[PDB]
Design an enzyme around this catalytic site. Structure first.
Site, mmCIF file in Angstrom:
data_model
loop_
_atom_site.group_PDB
_atom_site.id
_atom_site.type_symbol
_atom_site.label_atom_id
_atom_site.label_comp_id
_atom_site.label_asym_id
_atom_site.label_seq_id
_atom_site.Cartn_x
_atom_site.Cartn_y
_atom_site.Cartn_z
ATOM 1 N N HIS A 4 -13.221 39.203 27.036
ATOM 2 C CA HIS A 4 -12.918 38.084 28.117
ATOM 3 C C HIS A 4 -13.707 36.765 27.624
ATOM 4 C CE1 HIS A 4 -17.077 37.809 29.559
ATOM 5 N NE2 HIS A 4 -16.932 39.196 30.248
ATOM 6 N N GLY A 11 -23.425 34.000 31.574
ATOM 7 C CA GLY A 11 -23.602 33.793 30.237
ATOM 8 C C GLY A 11 -24.519 35.087 29.274
ATOM 9 N N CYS A 21 -23.314 37.878 29.345
ATOM 10 C CA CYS A 21 -22.119 38.814 28.660
ATOM 11 C C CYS A 21 -22.471 38.995 27.078
ATOM 12 C CB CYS A 21 -20.802 38.288 28.864
ATOM 13 S SG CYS A 21 -20.743 38.269 30.807
HETATM 14 C C1 LIG Z 1 -20.698 37.942 31.671
HETATM 15 C C2 LIG Z 1 -21.633 37.620 32.730
HETATM 16 O O1 LIG Z 1 -22.660 36.671 32.253
HETATM 17 C C3 LIG Z 1 -21.608 37.520 34.306
HETATM 18 N N1 LIG Z 1 -20.200 37.103 34.373
HETATM 19 C C4 LIG Z 1 -18.799 37.997 34.512
HETATM 20 O O2 LIG Z 1 -18.992 39.061 34.779
HETATM 21 N N2 LIG Z 1 -17.707 37.251 34.774
HETATM 22 C C5 LIG Z 1 -16.500 38.364 34.969
HETATM 23 C C6 LIG Z 1 -15.589 37.993 36.426
HETATM 24 C C7 LIG Z 1 -16.283 38.496 37.705
HETATM 25 O O3 LIG Z 1 -16.477 36.868 37.302
HETATM 26 C C8 LIG Z 1 -17.253 35.961 34.881
HETATM 27 O O4 LIG Z 1 -16.272 35.539 35.023
HETATM 28 N N3 LIG Z 1 -18.507 34.901 34.435
HETATM 29 C C9 LIG Z 1 -18.320 33.548 34.466
HETATM 30 C C10 LIG Z 1 -18.434 32.841 35.507
HETATM 31 C C11 LIG Z 1 -19.165 33.760 36.964
HETATM 32 O O5 LIG Z 1 -17.774 33.255 36.849
HETATM 33 C C12 LIG Z 1 -19.811 35.463 34.294
HETATM 34 O O6 LIG Z 1 -20.768 35.029 34.300
#
Ligand SMILES: C[C@@H](O)Cn1c(=O)n(C[C@H]2CO2)c(=O)n(C[C@@H]2CO2)c1=O
Ligand SMILES: C[C@@H](O)Cn1c(=O)n(C[C@H]2CO2)c(=O)n(C[C@@H]2CO2)c1=O
EC number: 3.4.19.12
Lengths: 305, 305
Positions: free
Chosen positions: A41, A143, A145
């Site tokens: 993603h 971030g 992730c």
């Molecule tokens: C990967 C980690 O850092 C957490 N994270 C995440 O799981 N998603 C998946 C979907 C639920 O939003 C995402 O899109 N983001 C980007 C910003 C929050 O919208 C994000 O930061």
């Protein structure tokens, strides 16, 4: 003496963490040999997070779109593919710091160490457990992730988790290093909820044994019980059913303390039915279930790497 | 999201940990540049631990008596001296992995990361705090002596603790990197007891702020209070007196939540007078006081190194 939540030394994994940028998004990636591993993603734009077709979004992406920064240097990307929910970016330089590693899919109840990172640089380290509902209670900000979970045995790093997302409930979901999600979770911004978070019974007993070793013996009682009868109290308190394999795993701890596993199961039952009455066990006012039997032995015998 | 006890990435310190053998005893040492740092009680024999004269025991010791093993290689010792309770062994090879380091004497209430080792090899990592009574509640088994505590800021490692001993009460005492013991403790096997272990009040408030950020707001009340009146409840519960500097340190957290420090002090007072009534804050049934205001900001803003 003393019992603490301990992470493994994170040095061998720090040197595998890189920054991966695809378009406008940046997340962390793991760099072993000539492959960089990151969540797929990374290629989703602002409005794509609800229902992306990852195959289609890949067509419009080529090697030079993925920019991989190692420390402060650039890695040249020469191949890429999509395995389940992770991308595999073939770079042209093997990592000089690749430790002896293995990819392992761990089972619910097992624990691992998580090296939290942002922009490919480490921030810290903590010990987590794979809840029975295939979620983890950790600390991830936007971030993080691509941060990975692992165990270290001898000189070998067994990678078992890559973080993908936070759920609307504040808990965390991710995959193994082959890209398969733990639990029924998908890399979409949809309505997905974790199930009942039951307690790891075998892990609570191991922690009670660790307590006995460290001088806390107030919870030891004059009762005993049977497995079937103990499980009937566990179910009422949403505790994972204790099997005979669990009992066998507790043998080494049971032999080192001269306390039968069933006598310890009887003390737990009392804690569940009567509470701790304002007492603390190993400095905690609730029953801890993120220590495995091997976790306790490791710390109470001083295993090193 | 999520709040966890986080240690710093321990990679930069792993490469400074060595094995030091003097006679029949082995303990860990820290190797920065061409000096190895270890506890001076490496030279005590079996019957010397009660009342050693370390100056005298040094006369009978020369360079070749101290054997320093780096990983699996041998370091050549060319100079040694005794500074307070640590030895300084000058070796003939600078460490290629010496990070940017500093020696710092931390204050009671501050926190650091501890890399537990045995025979010069790392075993794990956990976050500790210097209790007001100058002891730490950690996890050390026989031979962990020489394990170090540190903080990592930017690329610089600030070493602040070297472990020396466990007390008859199961807690731990040690020195800074100049060899001066934290608290009134000596490297002897004598009768020494830690004083009253009071609670780090400023750290409990910081943790309550971290809770508000993470969605737990049940402990917020409709009361407020004054410093003098709050301190009168703190003293009854053996809480460290809260000063105005502490209040100023909590400003950034107070501004990010729109909650005055005094209103948060009022909620704490309620917790102290009424208990948690079986509620949990950030997954814990007691008040946590091993998070500094900077610790919370670090984890709730995602600072990296
Ligand atoms: C990967 C980690 O850092 C957490 N994270 C995440 O799981 N998603 C998946 C979907 C639920 O939003 C995402 O899109 N983001 C980007 C910003 C929050 O919208 C994000 O930061
Ligand atoms: C350095 C750590 O590993 C703990 N430790 C220790 O503090 N002392 C100091 C004095 C109280 O005995 C000690 O003598 N030993 C050797 C074995 C226990 O007698 C020991 O292991």
């Amino acid at each position: 003496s003393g019992f603490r939540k301990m992470a493994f030394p994170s040095g061998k994994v720090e040197g595998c963490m890189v920054q991966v940028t695809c378009g406008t998004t940046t997340l962390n990636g793991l760099w072993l040999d000539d492959v960089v591993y990151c969540p797929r993603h990374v290629i989703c734009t602002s409005e794509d997070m609800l229902n992306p077709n990852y195959e289609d979004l890949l067509i419009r992406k080529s090697n030079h779109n993925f920019l991989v920064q190692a420390g402060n240097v650039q890695l040249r990307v020469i191949g890429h593919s999509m395995q389940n929910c992770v991308l595999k970016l073939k770079v042209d330089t093997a990592n000089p710091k690749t430790p002896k590693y293995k990819f392992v899919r761990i089972q619910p109840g097992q624990t691992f160490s998580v090296l939290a990172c942002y922009n490919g640089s480490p921030s810290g380290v903590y010990q987590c457990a794979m809840r029975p509902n295939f979620t983890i209670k950790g600390s991830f900000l936007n971030g993080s992730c691509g941060s990975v979970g692992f165990n270290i045995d001898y000189d070998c790093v067994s990678f078992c988790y890559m973080h993908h997302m936070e759920l609307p409930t504040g808990v965390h979901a991710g995959t193994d290093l082959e890209g398969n999600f733990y639990g029924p979770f998908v890399d979409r911004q949809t309505a997905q909820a974790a199930g009942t978070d039951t307690t790891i019974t075998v892990n609570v007993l191991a922690w009670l044994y660790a307590a006995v070793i460290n001088g806390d013996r107030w919870f030891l009682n004059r009762f005993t019980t049977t497995l079937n009868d103990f499980n009937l109290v566990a179910m009422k308190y949403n505790y994972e059913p204790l099997t005979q394999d669990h009992v066998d795993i507790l043998g080494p701890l049971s032999a080192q303390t001269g306390i039968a596993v069933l006598d310890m199961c009887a003390s737990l039952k009392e804690l569940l039915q009567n509470g701790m009455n304002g007492r603390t066990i190993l400095g905690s006012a609730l029953l801890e279930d993120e220590f495995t039997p091997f976790d306790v032995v490791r710390q109470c015998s001083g295993v090193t790497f």
